[PDB]
Design a protein around this ligand. Structure first.
Ligand SMILES: [Mg+2]
Ligand SMILES: [Mg+2]
Ligand SMILES: [Mg+2]
Ligand SMILES: [Mg+2]
Ligand SMILES: [Mg+2]
Ligand SMILES: [Mg+2]
Ligand SMILES: [Mg+2]
Ligand SMILES: [Mg+2]
Ligand SMILES: [Mg+2]
Lengths: 48, 203, 51, 217
RNA sequence: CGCGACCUCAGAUCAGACGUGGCGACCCGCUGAAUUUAAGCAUAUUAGUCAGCGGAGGAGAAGAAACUAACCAGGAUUCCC
RNA sequence: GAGACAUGAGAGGUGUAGAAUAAGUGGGAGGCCCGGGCCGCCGGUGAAAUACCACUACUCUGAUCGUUUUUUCACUGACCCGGUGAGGCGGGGGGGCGAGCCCCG
C-alpha cells in the first residue's frame, strides 16, 4: 500500500485470496495487476 | 523487488509491525508441539537464500529448543576432584541451539537430508527455528542436476557430523590468523598433526 | 532506542545521546553515524513541519 | 540580571568582535567593564597566578602610581611631575592623621621601591593593610629605566581564591576598533597554566550602570 | 441456514519409495576425567587425552580469501621439509 | 499520586554605636532627581559600611508545561492453578406467581 500510494497507482484490498487464485486458475494468488485495457471497458475503468 | 522488501522488513525487527508479528507467531509456535512440520516456509526469502526451492521434495520442519546454558549432568552437583573442574552451573555448550535444532530434525526425519535452517522467533524459554529438509529419493530432486549432490551417500547426517552452516560456525574454522586451531581441516586433525612424532627412516 | 535518542536530540543533549547510542549499539563509529542519521531525520521533519 | 531586551540570536564567537555602536545609551559615559568566567572551581582549594596586564583603554576613572619613589628615579618622576615628598609627609598622606577631606583609599597599587617599603608597616598607620594595599611587585612598576607603568597606570585585577570578579577597565567614549587588538588576553592567560580547572571557552559579562547584552563567547 | 473455494490439520494394511541395525583401523561432531609431574599441593600438567554418546566413506574432513602481508609483494584446500 | 527531572521564580539576615542588617559577585563621590533628589559615603578612620549601578547567586520559590524514575488501584491477553465425560457462562424478550413497588382510575 505505501508503494502504490507513493507511485500513485490505485490499489484496492479485495476480500479473498482464493477468489484471486480462482480467477487466475490456481489455488491461491496474492496480488493481481491491471495493465492497459481495450476500448469498450475503458469507461468501466473510468468509473471504477 | 518483493523479496528485497521482505528482507529489509525482517531486518527491522524492533518496529511495531514486526514485533507484533513476532509475538503472535511465537505464541502459536509455543502452543504447537515441539517438533512440527510446517506446510510452507514462514520466511520464503530467507529459505530461498538458504537453499530452499518450491519443488516437491523440499519440506520444512519447525523445531523448538529449550534455551539457556548447559548444566553439568552430575548427581547433587558433585564433580569429583580438581576445583578447576568443579563447575556445574555457568557452563556452555560448544554448539549452538540452531545446530541442536537441525540435529533433532535430522534425527526424527532420518530419511531426509538437512540442508539448512533459520530463526523464526524465540521467547525467553524457547527458541524456534525452521529447518529445510530434502527428500533425496524424490525424482524431482535426483532427476535434476545442481541438487543430486545431497542425494549422494556422503551427505547422510550433515547436521550430526557438524557440516551445516550452524555446525560449521560452531566448529570455528576459517582462513587466517584467527583460525590456527583448525589448520589441517579440523581441530583434532590439527592436534593430531602437531602432536604426532615423525620418526624418519634416516633421522 | 532510536526514538529515545531522537527525544534526546530534540532536547539537544547531544553528548548524552551519543553515550546512549554507544551503549545500545556498542561501537563509537556506529554510534556517531547513527547519531548523524537521526539528526538528519530530525532536521528533515523540522523543516517539513515549518513549511 | 541583564538589560531590558534580554535577547541574542548570535553565537558571538572568539572570531568576532563586531559589537558596540550605541553603548552610550543615555547622556552619561558608561562605566564599561571586563570580567573573567572561570567556571568549575572547588571552594576548598587554593589557586595562584594573579593577572596584571596593560589594557589600552585611556579611561576617565583613573588612579595613579606616584608614591613615593624616594629620590631615586627623579628623571622618571619629573616628566609626570609628582608631588615629591618624604617619609614624614607620608605619615601626613596616610590615614593616621585627620587633616583634610582626602581619600584615604586613593592609590592601592603604590610605587614598587626598594628603600621605604622596609619601614612602611611599623611606624605608619595600619590603614594600608586594613584597606589591603601594598607597593608590591605584582604591579610591575619599577619606573627607573625609561617608562614602564607611569603615564597610563591601568586599573589592575587579581586572581584570588574567589569565583567571580568585577573590575572596571574604565570608560571609552569611542568605538571598539582599538579594542579589537586591545582585548584578546583573558582566555589565553588563563589557559596557559593550571589545567586542573575549567576549559577554554565561555561568554563574558559586562554589566554596569546599564549593561548592554554583549556576551562575547 | 445449505452449497462451494482456500488455509490449517487428521486418518488409511491407500500407490510407490526411503530411514532404523552392524563394523568402527583411519575420519567428523560433541562430551570428557583421574592416575601422573610440579620431589607437598590447589592454578598449571597429564589433556581436549582415556573412558562415554552420535554420524559416515573408500577415504573422510577441508577448500576456491570478510587470507597472508607491509614486499619490487604473494594468491583455494590438504600433506612433507 | 509521589520523586531531582523543561523550568520559571517572590524571596538577603546582627559580635553590633548603625536612619532595618546602609550585609551578599556591584562601589559615581553622584549617574540621576528638577535648571534641587535620595537609606549615606572618604564625617562610629567604621564586618571590609554600602548616598549607588543587587552581571555570581545569597535560609534560595509556590507552581507552570514538557521528557524521565517509583508507589497504589484496576483490566486481561501472555503465563500459572483447579475442576469436568470442557453440560446450561455473559447479555437480552412476554403473560406473571407474589411488594401491589407504582401516574393509580
Ligand atoms: Mg588442575
Ligand atoms: Mg501402502
Ligand atoms: Mg606431586
Ligand atoms: Mg614423589
Ligand atoms: Mg599427595
Ligand atoms: Mg574415545
Ligand atoms: Mg549407522
Ligand atoms: Mg568431502
Ligand atoms: Mg564441504
Amino acid at each position: 500500500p505505501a508503494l502504490c500510494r507513493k507511485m500513485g497507482v490505485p490499489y484496492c484490498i479485495i476480500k479473498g485470496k482464493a477468489r484471486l487464485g480462482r480467477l487466475v486458475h490456481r489455488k491461491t494468488c496474492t496480488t493481481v495487476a491491471f495493465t492497459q485495457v481495450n476500448s469498450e471497458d475503458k469507461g468501466a475503468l473510468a468509473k471504477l | 523487488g518483493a523479496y528485497k522488501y521482505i528482507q529489509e522488513l525482517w531486518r527491522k525487527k524492533q518496529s511495531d509491525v514486526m514485533r507484533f508479528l513476532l509475538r503472535v507467531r511465537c505464541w502459536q509456535y509455543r502452543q504447537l508441539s515441539a517438533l512440527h512440520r510446517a506446510p510452507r516456509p514462514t520466511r520464503p526469502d530467507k529459505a530461498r537464500r538458504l537453499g530452499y526451492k518450491a519443488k516437491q521434495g523440499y519440506v520444512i520442519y519447525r523445531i523448538r529448543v529449550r534455551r539457556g546454558g548447559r548444566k553439568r549432568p552430575v548427581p547433587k552437583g558433585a564433580t569429583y576432584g580438581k576445583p578447576v573442574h568443579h563447575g556445574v552451573n555457568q557452563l556452555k555448550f560448544a554448539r549452538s541451539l540452531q545446530s541442536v535444532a537441525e540435529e533433532r530434525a535430522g534425527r526424527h526425519c532420518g530419511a531426509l537430508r538437512v540442508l539448512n535452517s533459520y530463526w523464526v522467533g524465540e521467547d525467553s524459554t524457547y527458541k524456534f527455528f525452521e529447518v529445510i529438509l530434502i527428500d533425496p529419493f524424490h525424482k524431482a530432486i535426483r532427476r535434476n542436476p545442481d541438487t543430486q549432490w545431497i542425494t549422494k551417500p556422503v551427505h547422510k547426517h550433515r547436521e550430526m557430523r557438524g557440516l551445516t552452516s550452524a555446525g560449521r560456525k560452531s566448529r570455528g574454522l576459517g582462513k587466517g590468523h584467527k583460525f590456527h586451531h583448525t589448520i589441517g581441516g579440523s581441530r583434532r586433525a590439527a592436534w593430531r598433526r602437531r602432536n604426532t612424532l615423525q620418526l624418519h627412516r634416516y633421522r | 532506542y532510536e526514538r529515545r535518542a531522537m527525544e534526546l536530540l530534540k532536547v539537544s543533549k547531544d553528548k548524552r545521546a551519543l553515550k546512549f547510542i554507544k551503549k545500545r549499539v556498542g561501537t563509537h563509529i556506529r554510534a556517531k553515524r547513527k547519531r548523524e542519521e537521526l539528526s538528519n531525520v530530525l532536521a528533515a521533519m523540522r523543516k517539513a513541519a515549518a513549511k | 540580571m541583564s538589560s531590558k531586551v534580554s535577547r541574542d540570536t548570535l553565537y558571538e564567537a572568539v572570531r568576532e568582535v563586531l559589537h558596540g555602536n550605541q553603548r552610550k545609551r543615555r547622556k552619561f559615559l558608561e562605566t564599561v567593564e571586563l570580567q573573567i568566567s572561570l567556571k568549575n572551581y572547588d571552594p576548598q582549594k587554593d589557586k595562584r597566578f594573579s593577572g596584571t596586564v596593560r589594557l589600552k583603554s585611556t579611561p576617565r576613572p583613573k588612579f595613579s602610581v606616584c608614591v613615593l619613589g624616594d629620590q631615586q628615579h627623579c628623571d622618571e618622576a619629573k616628566a609626570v611631575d609628582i608631588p615629591h615628598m618624604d617619609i614624614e609627609a607620608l605619615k601626613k598622606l596616610n590615614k593616621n592623621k585627620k587633616l583634610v577631606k582626602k581619600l584615604a583609599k586613593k592609590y592601592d597599587a603604590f610605587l614598587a621601591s626598594e628603600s621605604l617599603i622596609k619601614q612602611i608597616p611599623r611606624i605608619l598607620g595600619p590603614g594600608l593593610n586594613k584597606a589591603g594595599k601594598f607597593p608590591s611587585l605584582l604591579t610591575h612598576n619599577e619606573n627607573m629605566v625609561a617608562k614602564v607603568d607611569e603615564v597610563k597606570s591601568t586599573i589592575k585585577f587579581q586572581m584570588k581564591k574567589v569565583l567571580c570578579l568585577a573590575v572596571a577597565v574604565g570608560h571609552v567614549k569611542m568605538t571598539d576598533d582599538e579594542l579589537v587588538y586591545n582585548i584578546h588576553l583573558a582566555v589565553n592567560f588563563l589557559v596557559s597554566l593550571l589545567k586542573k580547572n575549567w576549559q577554554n571557552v565561555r561568554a563574558l559579562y559586562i554589566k554596569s550602570t546599564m549593561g548592554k547584552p554583549q556576551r562575547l563567547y
